[PDB]
Amino acid sequence: TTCCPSIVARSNFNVCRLPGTPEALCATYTGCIIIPGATCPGD
């Protein structure tokens, strides 16, 4: 699952993933975090 700390981070993460770019490269650039099993926090 991908968890993003803001709407802007989500739209950034989506744009970064477009070419099929590794999920952890885009997660690190945007502040999103990839976690095993869908469950996001108070962010």
Side-chain angles (χ1 to χ4, degrees), residues 9-14 16-43:
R10 175 65 68 179
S11 59
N12 289 355
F13 180 82
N14 289 343
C16 177
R17 289 278 285 113
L18 198 257
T21 312
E23 210 160 40
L25 187 91
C26 299
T28 292
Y29 182 91
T30 60
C32 299
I33 38 152
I34 310 167
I35 63 184
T39 181
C40 293
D43 279 62

